[PDB]
C-alpha cells in the first residue's frame, strides 16, 4: 500500500 503523491 502506498500513499497518493498528492498527499503532501
Amino acid at each position, epitope marked *: *500500500d*502506498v*500513499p*497518493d*503523491y*498528492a*498527499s*503532501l
Partner: antibody
Amino acid sequence: EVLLVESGGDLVKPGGFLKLSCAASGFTFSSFGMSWVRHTPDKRLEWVATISNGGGYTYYQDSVKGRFTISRDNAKNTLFLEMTSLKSEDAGLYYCARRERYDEKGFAYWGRGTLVTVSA
Amino acid sequence: DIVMTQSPSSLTVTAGEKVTMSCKSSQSLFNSGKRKNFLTWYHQKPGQPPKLLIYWASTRESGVPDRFSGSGSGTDFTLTITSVQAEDLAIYYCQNDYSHPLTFGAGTKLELKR
C-alpha cells in the same frame, strides 16, 4: 486495454443512500490507486474521494468527508463508493478514474459515468 | 485549497488560428520531488469523459496531437493550440494534481466564429 465501468447511479431521495461500483479490466487493479471524480450539472468537475492501491489511505473531498466511503475489493477488481445522507448538491455523473501510481500524471483512465440524481 | 482560475470562459475561434488560454493557481504546483509542476490539462466533449492532454504543465500525452502545447510555471500556466481545428472544440480544464484536494478550474469553452 484498461476499462472502467460504473454502476449504481439512480434517483435517490435526499438524506438516503446509494452505493456505486466501478469495474476494472485490463490492468493489475491491485497496483493502482483509484478516485471518484464527479461531473456536476453546472458542468464543473469535482474530485470526490481517492483510495490507495491497498486500501489503507482514503482521501475525501471535504464536502463528502463523513458521508461517503470509498472501498475497493482487489480480489474482484471493483472499487466502490457507499454514499449516505445525500444532499441535492451531490447529484451528477460519477466517474471512477485510475490514479497514475507510476507516472504521476493526472487522470489518464476514465470510466463512462453513472448518474446520481437527488430529489424528493 | 488551491484555487484554479481559467480565463476566459469562452473563446470564439476559427480553424487554423493560434489560441491561448490561461490557468492560474493560488499556490505553486511545483512538486520538488519530481521537479515537475503538477498541473494537468484536460478537455471533454459532450457525453464523453475528460481526455488528458498535457500533464506536468508541458508534457504531451501520447496520442494527443502535435498542436497542443502547455507551458508556464509556479502559478501561471497556459495552453496553446497553434492551428485550432474543428475537432478541438470542447471545454478545456486544468487541474491541480499536486496536493489534496484535487481542484479543477471552471473550464474554458471553445466555440466557433461565423
